[PDB]
Amino acid sequence: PDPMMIRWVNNKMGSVVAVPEELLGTHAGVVFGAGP
Amino acid sequence: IMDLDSATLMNLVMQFRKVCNHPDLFERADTSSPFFCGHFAETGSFLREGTNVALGYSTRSLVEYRL
Amino acid sequence: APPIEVVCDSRSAVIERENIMFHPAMRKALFGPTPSEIKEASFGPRPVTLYPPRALLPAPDHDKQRFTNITVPSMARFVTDSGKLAKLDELLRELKEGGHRVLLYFQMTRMIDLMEEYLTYRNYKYCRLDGSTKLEDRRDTVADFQTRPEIFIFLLSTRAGGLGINLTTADTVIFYDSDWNPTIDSQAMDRAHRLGQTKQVTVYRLITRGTIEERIRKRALQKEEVQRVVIT
Amino acid sequence: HRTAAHTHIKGLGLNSSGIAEKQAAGFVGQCAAREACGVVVDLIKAHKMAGRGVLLAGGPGTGKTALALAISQELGTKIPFCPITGSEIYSTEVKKTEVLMENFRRAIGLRVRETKDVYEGEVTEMTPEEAENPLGGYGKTISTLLIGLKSARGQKKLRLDPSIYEAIQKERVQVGDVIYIETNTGACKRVGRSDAYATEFDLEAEEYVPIPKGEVHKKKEIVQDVTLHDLDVANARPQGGQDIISMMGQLMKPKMTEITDKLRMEINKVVQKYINQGVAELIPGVLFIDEAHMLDIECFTYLNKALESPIAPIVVLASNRGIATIRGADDLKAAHGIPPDFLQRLLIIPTHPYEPDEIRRIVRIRAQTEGVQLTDAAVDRVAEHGVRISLRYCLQLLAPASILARVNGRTQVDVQDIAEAEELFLDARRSANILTSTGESGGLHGFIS
Amino acid sequence: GACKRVGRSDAYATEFDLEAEEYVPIPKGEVHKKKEIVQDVTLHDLDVANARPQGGQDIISMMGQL
Amino acid sequence: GLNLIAAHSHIRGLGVDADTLEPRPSSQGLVGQEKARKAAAVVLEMIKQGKIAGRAVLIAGPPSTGKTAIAMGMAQSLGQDVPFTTLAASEIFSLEMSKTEALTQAFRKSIGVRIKEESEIMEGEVVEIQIDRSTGGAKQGKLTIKTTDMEAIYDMGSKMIDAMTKERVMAGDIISIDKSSGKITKLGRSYARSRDYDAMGVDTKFLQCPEGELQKRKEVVHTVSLHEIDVINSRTQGFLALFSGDTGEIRSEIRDQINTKVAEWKEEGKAEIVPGVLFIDEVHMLDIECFSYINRALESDLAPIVIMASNRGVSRIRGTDYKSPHGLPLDFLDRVVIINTHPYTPDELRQILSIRAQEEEVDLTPDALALLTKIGQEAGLRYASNLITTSQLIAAKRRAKQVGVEDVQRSFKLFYDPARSVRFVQESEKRLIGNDGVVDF
Amino acid sequence: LIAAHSHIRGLGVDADTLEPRPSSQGLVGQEKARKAAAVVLEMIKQGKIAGRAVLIAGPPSTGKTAIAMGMAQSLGQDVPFTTLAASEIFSLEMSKTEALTQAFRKSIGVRIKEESEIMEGEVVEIQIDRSVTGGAKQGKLTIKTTDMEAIYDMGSKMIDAMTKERVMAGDIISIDKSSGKITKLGRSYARSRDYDAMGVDTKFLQCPEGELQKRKEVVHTVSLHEIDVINSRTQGFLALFSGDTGEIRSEIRDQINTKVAEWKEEGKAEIVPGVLFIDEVHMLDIECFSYINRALESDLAPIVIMASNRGVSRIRGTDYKSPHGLPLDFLDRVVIINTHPYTPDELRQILSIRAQEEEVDLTPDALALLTKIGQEAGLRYASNLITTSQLIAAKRRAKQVGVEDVQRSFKLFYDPARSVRFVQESEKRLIGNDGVVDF
Numbered sequence A: 001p002d003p004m005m006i007r008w009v010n011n012k013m014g015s016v017v018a019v020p021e022e023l024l025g026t027h028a029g030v031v032f033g034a035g036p
Numbered sequence B: 001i002m003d004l005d006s007a008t009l010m011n012l013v014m015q016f017r018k019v020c021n022h023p024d025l026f027e028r029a030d031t032s033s034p035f036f037c038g039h040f041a042e043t044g045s046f047l048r049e050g051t052n053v054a055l056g057y058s059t060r061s062l063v064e065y066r067l
Numbered sequence C: 001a002p003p004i005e006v007v008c009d010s011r012s013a014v015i016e017r018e019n020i021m022f023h024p025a026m027r028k029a030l031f032g033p034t035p036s037e038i039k040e041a042s043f044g045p046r047p048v049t050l051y052p053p054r055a056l057l058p059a060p061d062h063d064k065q066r067f068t069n070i071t072v073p074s075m076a077r078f079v080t081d082s083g084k085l086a087k088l089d090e091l092l093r094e095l096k097e098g099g100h101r102v103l104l105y106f107q108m109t110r111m112i113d114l115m116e117e118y119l120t121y122r123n124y125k126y127c128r129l130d131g132s133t134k135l136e137d138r139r140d141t142v143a144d145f146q147t148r149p150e151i152f153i154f155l156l157s158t159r160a161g162g163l164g165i166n167l168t169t170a171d172t173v174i175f176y177d178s179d180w181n182p183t184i185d186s187q188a189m190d191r192a193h194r195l196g197q198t199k200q201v202t203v204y205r206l207i208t209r210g211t212i213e214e215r216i217r218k219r220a221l222q223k224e225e226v227q228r229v230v231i232t
Numbered sequence D: 001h002r003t004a005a006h007t008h009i010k011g012l013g014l015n016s017s018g019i020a021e022k023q024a025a026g027f028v029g030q031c032a033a034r035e036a037c038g039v040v041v042d043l044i045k046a047h048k049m050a051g052r053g054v055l056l057a058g059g060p061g062t063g064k065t066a067l068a069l070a071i072s073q074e075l076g077t078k079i080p081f082c083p084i085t086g087s088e089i090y091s092t093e094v095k096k097t098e099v100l101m102e103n104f105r106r107a108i109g110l111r112v113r114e115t116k117d118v119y120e121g122e123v124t125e126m127t128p129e130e131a132e133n134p135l136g137g138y139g140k141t142i143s144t145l146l147i148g149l150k151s152a153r154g155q156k157k158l159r160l161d162p163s164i165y166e167a168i169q170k171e172r173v174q175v176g177d178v179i180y181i182e183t184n185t186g187a188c189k190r191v192g193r194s195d196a197y198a199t200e201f202d203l204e205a206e207e208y209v210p211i212p213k214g215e216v217h218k219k220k221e222i223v224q225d226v227t228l229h230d231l232d233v234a235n236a237r238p239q240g241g242q243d244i245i246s247m248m249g250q251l252m253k254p255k256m257t258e259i260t261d262k263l264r265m266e267i268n269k270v271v272q273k274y275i276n277q278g279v280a281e282l283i284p285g286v287l288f289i290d291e292a293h294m295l296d297i298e299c300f301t302y303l304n305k306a307l308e309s310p311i312a313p314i315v316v317l318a319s320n321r322g323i324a325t326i327r328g329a330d331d332l333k334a335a336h337g338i339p340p341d342f343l344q345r346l347l348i349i350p351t352h353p354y355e356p357d358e359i360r361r362i363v364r365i366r367a368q369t370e371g372v373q374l375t376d377a378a379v380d381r382v383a384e385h386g387v388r389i390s391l392r393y394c395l396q397l398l399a400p401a402s403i404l405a406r407v408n409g410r411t412q413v414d415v416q417d418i419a420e421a422e423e424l425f426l427d428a429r430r431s432a433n434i435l436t437s438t439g440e441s442g443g444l445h446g447f448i449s
Numbered sequence E: 001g002a003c004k005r006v007g008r009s010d011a012y013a014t015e016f017d018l019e020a021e022e023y024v025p026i027p028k029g030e031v032h033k034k035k036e037i038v039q040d041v042t043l044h045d046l047d048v049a050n051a052r053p054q055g056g057q058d059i060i061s062m063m064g065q066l
Numbered sequence F: 001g002l003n004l005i006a007a008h009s010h011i012r013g014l015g016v017d018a019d020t021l022e023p024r025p026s027s028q029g030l031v032g033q034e035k036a037r038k039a040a041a042v043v044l045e046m047i048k049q050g051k052i053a054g055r056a057v058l059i060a061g062p063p064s065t066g067k068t069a070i071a072m073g074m075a076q077s078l079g080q081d082v083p084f085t086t087l088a089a090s091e092i093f094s095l096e097m098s099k100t101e102a103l104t105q106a107f108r109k110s111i112g113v114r115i116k117e118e119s120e121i122m123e124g125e126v127v128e129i130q131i132d133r134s135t136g137g138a139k140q141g142k143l144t145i146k147t148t149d150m151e152a153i154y155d156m157g158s159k160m161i162d163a164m165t166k167e168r169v170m171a172g173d174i175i176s177i178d179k180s181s182g183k184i185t186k187l188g189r190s191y192a193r194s195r196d197y198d199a200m201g202v203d204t205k206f207l208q209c210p211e212g213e214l215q216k217r218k219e220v221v222h223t224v225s226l227h228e229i230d231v232i233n234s235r236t237q238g239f240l241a242l243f244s245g246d247t248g249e250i251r252s253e254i255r256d257q258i259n260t261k262v263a264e265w266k267e268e269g270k271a272e273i274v275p276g277v278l279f280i281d282e283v284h285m286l287d288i289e290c291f292s293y294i295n296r297a298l299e300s301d302l303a304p305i306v307i308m309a310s311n312r313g314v315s316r317i318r319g320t321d322y323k324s325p326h327g328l329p330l331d332f333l334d335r336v337v338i339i340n341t342h343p344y345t346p347d348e349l350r351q352i353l354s355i356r357a358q359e360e361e362v363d364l365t366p367d368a369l370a371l372l373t374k375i376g377q378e379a380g381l382r383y384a385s386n387l388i389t390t391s392q393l394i395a396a397k398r399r400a401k402q403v404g405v406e407d408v409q410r411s412f413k414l415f416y417d418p419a420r421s422v423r424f425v426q427e428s429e430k431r432l433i434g435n436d437g438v439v440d441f
Numbered sequence G: 001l002i003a004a005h006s007h008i009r010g011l012g013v014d015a016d017t018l019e020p021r022p023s024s025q026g027l028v029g030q031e032k033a034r035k036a037a038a039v040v041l042e043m044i045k046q047g048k049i050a051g052r053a054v055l056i057a058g059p060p061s062t063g064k065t066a067i068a069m070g071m072a073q074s075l076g077q078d079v080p081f082t083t084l085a086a087s088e089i090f091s092l093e094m095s096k097t098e099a100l101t102q103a104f105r106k107s108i109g110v111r112i113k114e115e116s117e118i119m120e121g122e123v124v125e126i127q128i129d130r131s132v133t134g135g136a137k138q139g140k141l142t143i144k145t146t147d148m149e150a151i152y153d154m155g156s157k158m159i160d161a162m163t164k165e166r167v168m169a170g171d172i173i174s175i176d177k178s179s180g181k182i183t184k185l186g187r188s189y190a191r192s193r194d195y196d197a198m199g200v201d202t203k204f205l206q207c208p209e210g211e212l213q214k215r216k217e218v219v220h221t222v223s224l225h226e227i228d229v230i231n232s233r234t235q236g237f238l239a240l241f242s243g244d245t246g247e248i249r250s251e252i253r254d255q256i257n258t259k260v261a262e263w264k265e266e267g268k269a270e271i272v273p274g275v276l277f278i279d280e281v282h283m284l285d286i287e288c289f290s291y292i293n294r295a296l297e298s299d300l301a302p303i304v305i306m307a308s309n310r311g312v313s314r315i316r317g318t319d320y321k322s323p324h325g326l327p328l329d330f331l332d333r334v335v336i337i338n339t340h341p342y343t344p345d346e347l348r349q350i351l352s353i354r355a356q357e358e359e360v361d362l363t364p365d366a367l368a369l370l371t372k373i374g375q376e377a378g379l380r381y382a383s384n385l386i387t388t389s390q391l392i393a394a395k396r397r398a399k400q401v402g403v404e405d406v407q408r409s410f411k412l413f414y415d416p417a418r419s420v421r422f423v424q425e426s427e428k429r430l431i432g433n434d435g436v437v438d439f
């Protein structure tokens, strides 16, 4: 539930990136497929 | 020099003991710094500025040039 | 020293000093952006630039002392500089590898304060017990030790260890000192070597060379000898 | 623990009445020089001195600098003593008179009490409070903070300037770092994570220290030993404070600059203000210029005005030259290389050569100083070399002759070891004789003439 | 387009009581003074002013060495 | 405290009369030299006149005949009003800059501008400070102060409360609020609140309350030379250069414009020009490249009077190869006007040694003074003036009060005068390195 | 490769008696100077005696630099050995005396010992939290050996090293906790079949056993010059490599000497005194000698060994002559070791060593002719003839070199004894101090 930090976690299965909900409306979600 | 400062006899024996233990019990200097040439502002007392105080950048040189 | 300034008694001189000698454009360009500016640049709908695009201060090339001249007494040169403490450092590393929560006993508890600083420094979970702590705190902290298998080193007054305390969970003893009465020393040993003791407890009496604690060791040993021959 | 060329000298070895007793405290003989050096030492330790010239004449190999180390070990630790040479002042950044004045103000010391005002706490809440920032290009600017320091007995919640915030910010102070803000400059050294945040599962290799006991606003006095040249360098290139001149002035490379007359007078007035407040104590010292004949005439011109100052240390010149030509102007010859005008300031101390028994005593002292024991016939052999060849040649035939003794299983040095080391290791005179004799013609087996 | 703040006017002088400005009176002349000035420039000054930035925005020169 | 007894700490002026210019033979330290001191008096009285250019007076004479003494007498007989600048002539050969420009700065350092303008200051003990920082900030506050006479309350602006927490003004400080700028110089601490100061030393000075009114105007008088203004108008913040010598080749148009604005300041009555004195000590250490500039820097309206001292006889000029009197070229000796000195008669030697003895406070028997005069006849003033300081200390060795013959004869025994040192060099040739040879016994 | 002093493998004396062997370890053919240099080497290895001066005088091409390299190979890579030439001191950046002071202080090693903390094990997961458009970073690293399973934290520099190294899940890394370097040792799993830009399959290592936090005691040797440069400048480090050090004031050296003495007493540091070799000292002028004679007066001066070539030469910067070009107030301090010209039965075996080093096979007639040439032109022409005859025998496809190859090389390349005659014959088509003509 962080305001502006984007998590990267890499385990033995794969590696995923979590984005907080509060950043999806911003310009940071254009790569992740949310956008303005 | 004392059989012929801080001359207590048990300063002698038990400070032989202390200097076995650790030398800094006998007085050590605290964390130092280089000498400062300028003019700061000395705090007046401890019992006035209780909790909410504000530091001021009071650093000026004693060397002045008057124009 | 601070740099030399001009004592000119107009308002314009003060404004020019605070616009040249400080000059906030260079300070902003050097240290970085305000967190308010970071928030308005990172919650906006579109990407926007920053006038200090990163913190333009160079990385200092000396890790322990950067951009100042202030000196803290370094931990090796702080409280170490004694052979008793040096061998104690070695054996404490050895008993950390052994996995045994040990002890201290000492006569003058300012040494116990400075050892507290040494052990907080080299990261050892510890507990302290002198006469200065109140009685309920004494029994409760020794209970908290004897219920917890991980806190690693005690601090005790030697002579005030002669209470009815219980130290079965302790398993090793270090005397940092050897003072006069053997029955105090052996009494604290008994406070470790209890009736409920499970394993061999070893005791390390730290000795110097050519110095007065060897004399006190000899005198106490003779008194112990006379004591044991009379009441054996 | 390294035996240098001057290790046996432990002082002048004077009596209570100022009379030099020979073979005492390292020296052998040399009466009229050591009594005059004792007079010079008590001239230094009386503070009625504002520039006096003391010349140490005498040929090479007679102990001119042994007297200088005797003076420097007779004055003590807490009196300044600056030894230089005559070749040291030819620099490439500044004119050489600047280097002379920098040595003159290295040779004057000051003992100052200072009252530092530390704020030694553990940072609890760090929150910036920016101010209004209209359209002026740079953007926002942090102007006020609310850092809360937490000592052991009584916390405090203080408010900061922008500059002390930048001092924090160039130290990377997070929440939990103990610091002590120095409210003389503004500097603030992070010490480490407080032990309330201690965890053995860590990787940053931080230094965990406990909470600083006592009041958070401490105040402590110290004693400092500062020369006047240190104050000159401090006011010349500023490296204290939190402004831009004193921050961009410690990223550049340091250069020796020409500290002018006005700064050297203003720092004199500042030091007089310290002394009149009953804080600082002045202790003048010695400038020992060895090999003064290497100084040219442009330096002996400036030593006149450098010694006419109301504050100037005592100069001790050494010069092993006879009638010679001064380096600057090559058309006036004089004694010692000193010009005939500057020579009148000097209180000239002579130094006389040695005797065939004084050489024996010096050889014995040097052998029992280095740690080489030997027999009396070997001492007579080395003294024979000392009379024939040189003084500081025969002292140097003891260090191979020990090693060669240890080759042959011996402990003491006999006649055979010195008779072999005199053949392996040669002096300058017989080497020049071999040079002139063998080097007859230039060619394949000759010398480049 | 050159501007200088001369001071704070003396009608607003005693607003507070220990403010720190230079209280000067209102000028008792025109507001629009029109005067003409003949003035010389040497070409070397043109050369220096076109080679290196001079005086106005040259704030890094307070270091001094290089 | 920084008043250590030097070789010229006994001269308290030129010592001559200022009404008929008579050199009275013993006053203010300068004793014995008559004609040269009268000529220096004439030069001194035409310096303070101001209605003359930069001219050149050459104090020529033998070694140790009182040339730096006359110059220091003229330095002490002006006060801190007309700028006197010493210049030993080897400070010119620098590497931070050229050599002719280093000479030009030494000419510009000796032409002062003296301007007098007023400030408004406030004395007084602070009775109490209240600051309404309640989250609030530095917005409003009350300052109650007093002198012995006055007492007052002031309200403060925001940019004054930010200077009150900047200097940390307590309840009892003796401050000086300069009203036009806002700086606060604490003159000290008041005695009557000695209990109220805990974070001070055990030994701490305390003042009394200031006497008089609390709001007064000072007529301070500043005096800065033209080199000061030149170095100020050379960089962004360039006055640091004249404290660190890092000034370089200053372009000449700056000096020309400042020579114009000083004249425009003089004609408006805002300023006043004070021509100083430049003392070029040991002027023979200049090459002909210097004299070809001093011949033309002594031509302008703004040029200080140059006083200069030469020892050499017929010697060579540096840079060239041809000899000349006093080490100076003849086209430059046309400019200068020469004052010649003379060696000292023995009674004048005796009373100069008497002044140097009374300056260091050393007691002398008259027999020792006669012996010391006899030594100074044969070895100069400097040797005997050092034998005084040596003989006091040798008398302090054996716990005596007055020096005698038995200590002057020891100081003459240990420390050789330079004549016997020259004899020592001439009689110890083969071991002292002349040019080539070293003989070891 | 094969330089002019690659055959030398030390000084070649005994360890108990230090007698000069007539043929041992390259330095073959001289006995007096090698024995004296063995004595100098032994009093350098003792380390007690400070501030001497050894002057290896003799004719050129007699093996002076060979004796110097023999002492250099005999000390090993422990004691500093500065190979200073006398012309390097004349800088334009710094002064002429301060270059000598740096040349002395480069030859006093300080050997300190410090404890680092190294990790070991298999990375299980990386967890990196990053901001948007500038900001701090957060890091959690789970690492597992066969015994422990730790979840460590990370700062900014550790993440800046992880992303530089690209440490994925399943890597055997070892992190020094003090210095903060990351060296990947290999992997335990295989490469995934899900991503494209992964990398190269590294070495297959198993999971390491033991513990995570292991301690290590490393030994670091720095010269005093490096301590001077790192303590003379606030931020301007790395100037001890790029030579940008202008001047170090004396207040810095008089503090560093005291702190090194304190480090010597505390058992922290150990002072290893070294050798300053000055090749062809006759180029220094008298302003250098007036400082070299007085820098050999303290406890921190290295034992100076230096060479010379000249007879009665004039000292530079002066007007007069002296033996070896050195002043007679400086020649009292020094101790001069002479070297002698060679004999042909020694030149034969020296050329044999030089031939066996450059992998050249010979015939005894060619070696006899080569020795006859080396009698008249020195070793410096004969060794060049060896290499040249090797390549001419390689051109005409011969196994071993012969008399004809040596005669060919002697015909092509003149020795200096014939080039002097070549100058002295045609003096009209060479520019002397005067004009020249063209046919």
Ligand SMILES: Nc1ncnc2c1ncn2[C@@H]1O[C@H](COP(=O)(O)OP(=O)(O)O)[C@@H](O)[C@H]1O
Binding pocket: D005, D006, D026, D027, D028, D029, D030, D059, D060, D061, D062, D063, D064, D065, D066, D067, D320, D362, D391, D392
């Ligand atoms: N009186 C003395 N007693 C003992 N050693 C002396 C004496 N005089 C000179 N020496 C020795 O002479 C050597 C060189 O003396 P030094 O002062 O360097 O000569 P110089 O006067 O030429 O500089 C020193 O190593 C010192 O041991």
Ligand SMILES: Nc1ncnc2c1ncn2[C@@H]1O[C@H](COP(=O)(O)OP(=O)(O)O)[C@@H](O)[C@H]1O
Binding pocket: F007, F008, F029, F030, F031, F032, F033, F062, F063, F064, F065, F066, F067, F068, F069, F070, F352, F355, F381, F382
């Ligand atoms: N008239 C005088 N009165 C007092 N002292 C004098 C007088 N003339 C010379 N002296 C002393 O003689 C010394 C030499 O004078 P000075 O001018 O320094 O010689 P020089 O002209 O060679 O520099 C000075 O120390 C000064 O104290």
Ligand SMILES: Nc1ncnc2c1ncn2[C@@H]1O[C@H](COP(=O)(O)OP(=O)(O)O)[C@@H](O)[C@H]1O
Binding pocket: G004, G005, G026, G027, G028, G029, G030, G059, G060, G061, G062, G063, G064, G065, G066, G067, G350, G379, G380
């Ligand atoms: N005794 C020797 N042993 C081995 N090689 C030698 C010997 N003497 C000379 N040399 C060889 O001759 C060459 C010249 O020696 P070097 O020391 O360079 O002469 P110089 O001292 O004149 O510079 C070197 O390359 C070396 O390999």
